[PDB]
Amino acid sequence: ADTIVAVELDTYPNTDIGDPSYPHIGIDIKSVRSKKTAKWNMQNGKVGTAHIIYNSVGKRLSAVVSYPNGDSATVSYDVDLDNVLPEWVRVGLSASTGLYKETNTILSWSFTSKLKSTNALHFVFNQFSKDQKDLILQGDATTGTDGNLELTRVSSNGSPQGSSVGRALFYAPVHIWESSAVVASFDATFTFLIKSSDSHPADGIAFFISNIDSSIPSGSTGRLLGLFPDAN
Amino acid sequence: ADTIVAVELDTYPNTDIGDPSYPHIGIDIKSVRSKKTAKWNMQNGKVGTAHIIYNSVGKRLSAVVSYPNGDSATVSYDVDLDNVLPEWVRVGLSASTGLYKETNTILSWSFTSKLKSTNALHFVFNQFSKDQKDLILQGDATTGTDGNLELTRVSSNGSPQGSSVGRALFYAPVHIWESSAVVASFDATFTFLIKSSDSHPADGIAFFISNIDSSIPSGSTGRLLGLFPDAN
Amino acid sequence: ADTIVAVELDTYPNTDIGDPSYPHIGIDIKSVRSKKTAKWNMQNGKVGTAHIIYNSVGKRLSAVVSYPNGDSATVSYDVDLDNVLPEWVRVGLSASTGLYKETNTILSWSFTSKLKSETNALHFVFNQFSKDQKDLILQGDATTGTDGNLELTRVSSNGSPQGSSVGRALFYAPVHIWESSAVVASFDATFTFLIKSSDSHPADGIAFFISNIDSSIPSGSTGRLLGLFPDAN
Amino acid sequence: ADTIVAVELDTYPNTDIGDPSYPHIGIDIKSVRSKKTAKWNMQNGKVGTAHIIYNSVGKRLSAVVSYPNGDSATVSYDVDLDNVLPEWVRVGLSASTGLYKETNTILSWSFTSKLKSTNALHFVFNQFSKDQKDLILQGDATTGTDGNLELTRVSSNGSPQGSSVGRALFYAPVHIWESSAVVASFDATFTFLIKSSDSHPADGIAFFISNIDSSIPSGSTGRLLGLFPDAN
Numbered sequence: 040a041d042t043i044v045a046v047e048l049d050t051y052p053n054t055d056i057g058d059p060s061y062p063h064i065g066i067d068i069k070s071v072r073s074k075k076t077a078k079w080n081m082q083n084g085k086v087g088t089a090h091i092i093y094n095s096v097g098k099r100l101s102a103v104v105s106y107p108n109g110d111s112a113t114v115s116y117d118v119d120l121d122n123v124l125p126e127w128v129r130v131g132l133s134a135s136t137g138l139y140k141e142t143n144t145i146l147s148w149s150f151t152s153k154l155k156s157t158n159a160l161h162f163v164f165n166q167f168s169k170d171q172k173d174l175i176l177q178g179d180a181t182t183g184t185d186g187n188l189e190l191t192r193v194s195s196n197g198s199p200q201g202s203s204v205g206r207a208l209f210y211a212p213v214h215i216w217e218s219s220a221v222v223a224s225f226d227a228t229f230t231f232l233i234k235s236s237d238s239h240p241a242d243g244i245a246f247f248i249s250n251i252d253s254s255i256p257s258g259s260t261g262r263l264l265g266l267f268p269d270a271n
Numbered sequence: 272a273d274t275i276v277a278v279e280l281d282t283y284p285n286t287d288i289g290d291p292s293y294p295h296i297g298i299d300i301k302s303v304r305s306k307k308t309a310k311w312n313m314q315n316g317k318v319g320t321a322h323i324i325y326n327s328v329g330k331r332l333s334a335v336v337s338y339p340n341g342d343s344a345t346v347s348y349d350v351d352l353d354n355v356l357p358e359w360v361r362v363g364l365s366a367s368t369g370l371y372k373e374t375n376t377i378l379s380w381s382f383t384s385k386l387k388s389t390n391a392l393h394f395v396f397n398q399f400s401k402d403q404k405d406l407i408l409q410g411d412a413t414t415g416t417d418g419n420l421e422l423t424r425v426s427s428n429g430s431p432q433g434s435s436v437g438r439a440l441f442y443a444p445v446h447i448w449e450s451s452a453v454v455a456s457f458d459a460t461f462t463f464l465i466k467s468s469d470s471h472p473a474d475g476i477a478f479f480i481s482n483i484d485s486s487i488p489s490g491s492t493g494r495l496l497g498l499f500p501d502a503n
Numbered sequence: 504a505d506t507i508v509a510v511e512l513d514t515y516p517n518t519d520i521g522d523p524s525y526p527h528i529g530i531d532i533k534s535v536r537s538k539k540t541a542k543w544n545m546q547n548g549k550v551g552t553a554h555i556i557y558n559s560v561g562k563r564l565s566a567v568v569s570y571p572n573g574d575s576a577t578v579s580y581d582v583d584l585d586n587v588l589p590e591w592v593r594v595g596l597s598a599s600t601g602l603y604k605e606t607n608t609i610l611s612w613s614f615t616s617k618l619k620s621e622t623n624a625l626h627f628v629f630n631q632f633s634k635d636q637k638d639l640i641l642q643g644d645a646t647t648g649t650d651g652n653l654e655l656t657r658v659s660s661n662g663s664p665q666g667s668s669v670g671r672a673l674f675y676a677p678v679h680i681w682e683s684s685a686v687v688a689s690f691d692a693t694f695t696f697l698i699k700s701s702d703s704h705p706a707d708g709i710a711f712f713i714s715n716i717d718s719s720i721p722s723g724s725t726g727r728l729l730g731l732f733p734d735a736n
Numbered sequence: 737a738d739t740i741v742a743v744e745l746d747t748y749p750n751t752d753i754g755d756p757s758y759p760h761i762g763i764d765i766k767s768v769r770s771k772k773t774a775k776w777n778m779q780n781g782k783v784g785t786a787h788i789i790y791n792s793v794g795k796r797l798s799a800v801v802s803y804p805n806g807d808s809a810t811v812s813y814d815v816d817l818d819n820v821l822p823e824w825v826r827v828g829l830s831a832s833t834g835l836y837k838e839t840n841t842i843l844s845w846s847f848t849s850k851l852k853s854t855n856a857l858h859f860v861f862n863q864f865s866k867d868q869k870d871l872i873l874q875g876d877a878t879t880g881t882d883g884n885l886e887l888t889r890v891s892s893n894g895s896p897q898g899s900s901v902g903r904a905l906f907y908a909p910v911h912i913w914e915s916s917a918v919v920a921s922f923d924a925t926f927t928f929l930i931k932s933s934d935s936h937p938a939d940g941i942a943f944f945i946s947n948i949d950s951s952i953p954s955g956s957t958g959r960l961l962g963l964f965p966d967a968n
């Protein structure tokens with residue numbers, strides 16, 4: 040399918056594939072099986088902010104999820120991404136549901152990347168339009184009017200759908216490393232609103248990186264976050 | 272063809288269509304006929320820089336072209352681009368030759384846009400990659416090997432070609448003005464080498480703004496700068 | 504005294520000295536007499552936002568002040584600041600009160616300057632202020648901190664703001680504002696603010712200013728002179 | 737003296753104090769003995785760039801020193817700067833000479849810091865003017881006319897003096913870290929020309945962080961890089 044590097048906000052403990060007994064945050068290289076997890080304290084109904092950072096000098100792809108109360112989840116992964124992604128990729132946001140469900144409402148999304156050899160990209164979405172000409176949208180992802188990006192299906196009465204999946208990706212393919220680059224570095228941030236009413240909500244939100252032509256790998260609702268075509 | 276708002280570095284004095292009887296810089300709205308021109312003193316074989324600035328509050332469209340020596344040309348035009356551009360555009364560069372020719376070699380290209388309602392796009396190319404996936408090149412425009420975007424066709428021994436039109440469009444649509452935003456604005460910078468040993472070289476370089484789906488009007492080589500299909 | 508170049512949010516109609524008969528916004532070159540005014544429609548007790556844009560190529564200095572409900576205000580002014588201000592200045596925020604009063608609560612302050620000669624550039628942004636802010640020269644009744652806010656005019660424990668107050672806040676470093684090398688010498692500056700009162704009118708307002716590195720509140724610049732000018736000249 | 741954290745471009749193999757026996761770059765914490773080092777092939781008279789990076793999330797400090805023909809050098813140190821620097825600091829540059837001598841010529845210097853709760857500071861010198869009011873100069877450091885900050889004393893004929901200490905500190909302080917800070921991260925950049933025909937040259941260039949009131953320690957000339965009061 041694609042080649043994927045992603046940041047998982049697993050709200051549901053899918054443990055026969057392999058997720059610890061609780062909600063967590065993970066680093067995925069080419070698999071739904073996180074190379075690294077951290078316990079996360081999903082705070083329902085509140086707006087949280089996520090930051091992801093990587094430089095190719097320190098080689099440690101990192102992630103932070105927090106809330107205004109202050110609760111913070113953190114994970115690291117030493118890696119030369121250099122070895123997993125192509126010279127050209129796209130950047131996007133992913134979120135799914137299944138049996139259990141939640142809203143997946145992104146209120147803003149800002150990303151930056153440089154190749155200090157410079158070449159650099161810096162886009163930042165603080166409010167989303169009804170028709171957003173610079174976002175490829177796949178799956179149940181749809182925007183506007185309340186100004187927000189809605190990654191997963193939400194009906195009229197503020198009710199999240201079971202078995203939904205959606206993705207939004209910036210229009211322009213992002214050069215992310217080169218042979219020329221002395222420093223291949225990126226950062227990316229998003230402010231989300233997960234709120235449900237189940238036992239535990241499901242399934243999560245992910246920031247992702249992959250090949251320019253990445254679509255949804257069919258049958259990736261629920262526990263696969265609309266990212267992988269199997270749980271291998 | 273398409274809608275245009277552009278900035279000409281008009282080198283060849285095509286006066287049976289309204290150019291002044293000399294090399295000039297000028298602001299064109301919807302026409303190869305500049306609403307304001309200024310005496311440019313071209314400096315052949317040298318590396319110059321153009322800045323274009325527009326802020327939607329004071330509504331003044333501005334342009335500067337300078338050489339390292341210290342010589343500068345300037346041209347203003349007050350206007351609510353509000354009435355000439357659509358909500359969504361594309362941005363790029365254009366150069367052309369006809370009977371007399373020149374090199375049209377962009378060394379760097381950068382652009383920023385914001386909607387302080389904030390939304391913002393900011394790209395900067397200090398080198399041009401061989402297969403540069405985030406550029407929509409059209410006509411004889413091609414990157415590569417020297418590090419540079421060759422807008423008009425050049426032969427192997429460095430000898431430029433006549434009757435050659437070239438264009439380079441940054442990949443993404445660019446929200447340029449919003450109903451919603453309090454301040455809509457942009458800036459655009461580029462470095463060039465124009466070299467020839469003709470009587471006057473021809474025809475000149477342009478930064479342009481036009482509707483997302485924009486293509487070179489046929490027969491727009493030379494004096495029309497790969498921007499307009501009539502001389503109206 | 505100093506050099507001032509500022510933008511006033513002139514809430515009180517000081518007219519025996521030449522504002523007009525309403526809350527306005529003005530470009531002030533070296534005079535509390537604004538070279539250009541535009542009607543502003545004060546929306547008491549809401550957070551508004553100002554942008555102040557200047558490029559050296561266009562030579563037009565602009566101002567916008569708006570509220571959430573989208574109510575706008577615009578004024579511009581053609582000028583070469585090349586030739587008023589010197590090569591080096593300080594930049595800041597000023598407010599005042601008098602026989603009438605208001606909160607002068609700045610919530611965020613941001614400023615960016617460039618000399619496109621590969622550039623010399625300065626970008627700072629204040630989304631929180633702190634109980635100490637080692638990078639903000641604080642003059643007069645000014646105080647950061649505690650609620651998170653820069654407090655330019657005296658407020659008390661009871662939310663009740665004090666009449667006849669004056670304050671200034673300035674970034675700690677000088678700013679190369681224009682050079683003889685610079686093809687473009689350009690700034691922009693943004694702030695968000697909360698002005699609340701109850702008096703017949705409130706007074707007196709908020710201003711963004713540029714002046715010499717050594718600038719300091721002129722004596723008796725409380726009230727209609729915004730902690731900006733030693734005379735009504 | 738005060739408190740230091742720095743990145744050393746150690747050009748002289750000082751070994752009765754620790755330096756590995758060759759030109760290197762090192763991360764120094766509160767001691768001239770680098771807690772980390774890496775071999776660097778000093779390229780005489782050529783212009784090189786150093787990038788430094790740290791994010792409080794992944795807690796890894798990074799340095800690259802490279803010349804334009806591709807040759808790099810890398811060294812990394814995991815550390816919680818919570819612990820070593822204070823809420824408030826000054827950012828500055830240092831170099832020195834001793835028994836042996838070199839040109840300590842900085843051709844550009846830029847730094848950025850943020851507190852992503854955003855509070856941010858972003859400054860950059862691409863040309864150093866003669867009288868510069870935003871720099872604190874210390875020791876033998878001087879600027880202007882040629883366009884470059886001269887960290888150690890060079891006389892008229894361009895002959896670099898032996899036994900010279902110099903420092904340049906950016907005027908305003910920097911909030912490096914706070915308690916509210918969910919992320920607090922920085923990066924620096926500088927371009928430099930070290931030229932000499934000594935035996936081995938000396939002593940090297942360093943980027944530093946330290947407290948607002950910091951100044952050159954007495955007899956910190958030569959092998960101490962104008963940073964440390966003793967060789968401990």
Ligand SMILES: Nc1ncnc2c1ncn2[C@H]1C[C@H](O)[C@@H](COP(=O)(O)OC[C@H]2O[C@@H](n3cnc4c(N)ncnc43)C[C@@H]2O)O1
Nearest residue numbers: 149151152153159160161163391393622624846848858860
């Ligand atoms: N809406 C925003 N949100 C969050 N950060 C923002 C935003 N808007 C600007 N920033 C900033 C923060 C970073 O400094 C920079 C990221 O890199 P770029 O790839 O654009 O390179 C550096 C930028 O910083 C500028 N700056 C101006 N002059 C010099 C300079 N000489 N060196 C470095 N940076 C400079 C120009 C470049 O656009 O963009």
